[PDB]
Symmetry: none
Subunit: 24 residues, 3 copies
């Protein structure tokens, strides 16, 4: 029989920068 499934992959990338803040 085939061996065990591999480990979880690496963690994904950080998400994008947030959007602009509110008008001053």
């Amino acid at each position: 029989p085939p061996g065990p499934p591999g480990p979880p992959g690496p963690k994904g990338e950080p998400g994008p920068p947030g959007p602009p803040g509110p008008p001053g």
Copy 2:
């Protein structure tokens, strides 16, 4: 033997909204 590590995970959430615009 165990299989290979899986694919990288998905990207994270967009970051928090930015700060308010500057005073004045």
Copy 3:
């Protein structure tokens, strides 16, 4: 035989804060 690929890795971190908003 080698096991198959593992599952997808964890979801990434939130991104950095967005830019300061417009001047008022």
